[PDB]
Nucleic acid binder design. Structure first.
Lengths: 222, 42, 237, 40
DNA sequence: CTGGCCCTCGCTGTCAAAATTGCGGCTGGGTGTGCGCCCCCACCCCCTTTTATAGCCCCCCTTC
RNA sequence: ACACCCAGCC
DNA sequence: GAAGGGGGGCTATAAAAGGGGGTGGGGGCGGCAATTTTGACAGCGAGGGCCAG
């Protein structure tokens, strides 16, 4: 008993299942039934030396499909199941392969044409304009993004110069938070004028050259 | 034919000396073989 | 006077790890690179409104003159370029409205106007005053109106300006009102939204220009024009 | 000139190489021939 | 001191691959064409207040 | 200039 | 809820204050086809040392 164990009762019973290949129209019709319970019937006849297989469509669903059997020994076809409880089980092994073909030959090509037409509905190709487009690059006093940015800039305003002790308090919180820093991020965190930050940082801080990215300031007084 | 190791002579000035000349030019095929190799010429 | 280095051709051209040992280290000045950036931006700006190359060349000339004269170092090169494009368009007799140059630039009407004023001061030159006529072929064609309407609008705007019916109104506003009140006289009709968005004028600007131009309706039209609509049938806002 | 003027008239190609290719074969060293032979 | 044998080692021939230059002679047309990132340092513009002026234009209010 | 076509005669 | 209307801000100039922030200008960091040459390899010679001679 385990999550990944595969149950093999079906194999021990040697249950034989049928693998059937059907076209799109039959599957779509069966899906349209909304799981009513029945969608058709299958007729298997056995003569003295031959076997005939066919599928009879339900008359209600519409408002004769011959079946061809193929070789089975080419590959070992089986089926397994996975559930919401993460339990793996093997339903069984495929014992025979089936191919479904339409009885109609010429009139079914009309349905094929309709299917192709439906498949070509969403494919897009360029159109042609009778008149040149003039709705673009329309004159405007100012761009929307620009006026938005100026409105934001004038609501927030300039970052106000503060006394030395309080900016030093932000610096103290800063190199308590992290050892190393980048000049831009320090400006963003402290919210102070860049020249005033440089003036108050040069007195206590020093710049250390690095061969990896760029020279940077150090918040340690020593 | 490419950005401003590329094919050259893909586009040519249409020949307007005679109507037969224009038709012949509009229906021409070019082989990119260098201009040696007698087999592609046959 | 400089030359480029082409792509590598063999093993000797490359280095130990997937990179060429010779690179396109250009020796361009800051000045030449900044003004080439500006010419490239001017061409992009001009092709947005389908200006011919001669206006682009005139704009390049004005930009070079300003950039050598060196009096506007503090203004963005893109604003100087926009103002130069405006001056070049105005000098060729095919002026574009300030809002039209704004629409193809990141630079506002405030900033391009200030740079235009400052460029005119620096170059010690002058430009002809715009007449409600030059802004007609475009503002109409873009709105798709017949040629008899071209003549009607041109004549009527010129006559309205000539006899000083409209005091101090900008030529754009008078031109747009002419287009409005010559369009309804023909079969082809145009609402306020189209003319406003295609000429740059607001609805209140075009409405009060219409109410100013309305009373002298019949005397202002050209004599030889097909009145598809009666003169008294024009709707008053 | 007297040996190069006939060369303009000769054509190209048991098989024994002859014509302009053999003239190239002869006036060069050609350490590897085209059609070696021995008249034994 | 003399002679028979196998060893590391020096040198050579031989094969192979990479590297190299040229590929007819004249002629007549036409047609086109001419970095890049990220940072640091000087200099200038806008922030704000005042007031007159007027056309233009956004926003809110009101109508039906 | 340069380049690219085309073409003429062998 | 679309249309017309009213009130009010935006636009340009003007001097001036001081400083922040934007902008440029640095600015260093970042095809055939015979020949020719060289090398790599497989091989081989003479001699050394050992053992015998």
């Amino acid at each position: 008993a385990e999550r990944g164990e595969l149950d093999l009762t079906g194999a021990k019973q040697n249950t034989g299942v049928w693998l059937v290949k059907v076209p799109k129209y039959l599957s779509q019709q069966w899906a349209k039934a909304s799981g009513r319970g029945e969608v058709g019937k299958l007729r298997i006849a056995k003569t003295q030396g031959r076997t005939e297989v066919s599928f009879t469509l339900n008359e209600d669903l519409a408002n004769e499909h011959p079946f061809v059997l193929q070789s089975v020994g080419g590959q070992t076809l089986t089926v397994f199941t996975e559930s919401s409880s993460d339990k793996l089980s093997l339903e069984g092994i495929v014992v025979q392969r089936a191919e479904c073909r339409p009885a109609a030959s010429e009139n079914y090509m009309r349905l094929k044409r309709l299917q192709i037409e439906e498949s070509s509905k969403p494919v897009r190709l360029s159109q042609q304009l009778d008149k040149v487009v003039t709705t673009n690059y329309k004159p405007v006093a100012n761009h929307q993004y620009n006026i938005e940015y100026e409105r934001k800039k004038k609501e927030d305003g300039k970052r106000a110069r503060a006394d030395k002790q309080h900016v030093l308090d932000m610096l103290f919180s800063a190199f308590e938070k992290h050892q190393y820093y980048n000049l831009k991020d320090l400006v963003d965190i402290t919210k102070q004028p860049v020249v005033y930050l440089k003036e108050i940082l040069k007195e206590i801080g020093v710049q250390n050259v690095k061969g990896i990215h760029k020279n940077t300031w150090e918040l340690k007084p020593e | 034919w490419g950005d401003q190791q590329a094919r050259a002579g893909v586009s040519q000035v249409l020949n307007r000396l005679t109507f037969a000349s224009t038709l012949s030019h509009l229906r021409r095929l070019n082989s990119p073989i260098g201009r040696k190799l007698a087999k592609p010429r046959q | 006077l400089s030359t480029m280095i082409g792509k590598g051709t063999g093993a000797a051209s490359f280095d130990e790890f997937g990179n060429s040992k010779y690179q396109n280290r250009r020796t361009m000045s800051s000045s030449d690179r900044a003004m080439m950036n500006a010419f490239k931006e001017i061409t992009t700006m001009a092709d947005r409104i389908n200006l011919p190359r001669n206006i682009v060349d005139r704009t390049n000339n004005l930009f070079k003159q300003v950039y050598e004269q060196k009096s506007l170092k503090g203004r963005a090169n893109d604003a100087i370029a926009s103002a130069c494009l405006y001056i070049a368009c105005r000098q060729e007799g095919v002026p574009r409205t300030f809002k039209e140059i704004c629409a193809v630039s990141r630079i506002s009407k405030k900033e391009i106007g200030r740079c235009f004023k400052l460029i005119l001061k620096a170059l010690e030159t002058s430009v002809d005053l715009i007449t409600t006529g030059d802004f007609m072929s475009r503002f109409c064609s873009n709105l798709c109106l017949p040629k008899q309407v071209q003549m009607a609008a041109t004549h009527i705007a010129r006559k309205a300006v000539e006899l000083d019916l409209v005091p101090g109104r900008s030529p754009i506003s008078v031109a747009a009102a002419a287009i409005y009140m010559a369009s309804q006289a023909s079969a082809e009709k145009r609402t306020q939204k189209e003319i406003g968005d295609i000429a740059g004028v607001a609805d209140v600007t075009i409405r009060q220009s219409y109410r100013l131009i309305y009373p002298r309706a019949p005397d202002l039209f050209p004599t030889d024009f097909k009145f598809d609509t009666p003169v008294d049938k024009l709707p008053q806002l | 000139q007297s040996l190069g003027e006939p060369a303009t008239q000769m054509t190209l190609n048991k098989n024994v190489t002859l014509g302009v290719p053999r003239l190239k074969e002869l006036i060069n060293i050609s350490k590897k021939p085209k059609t070696p032979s021995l008249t034994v």
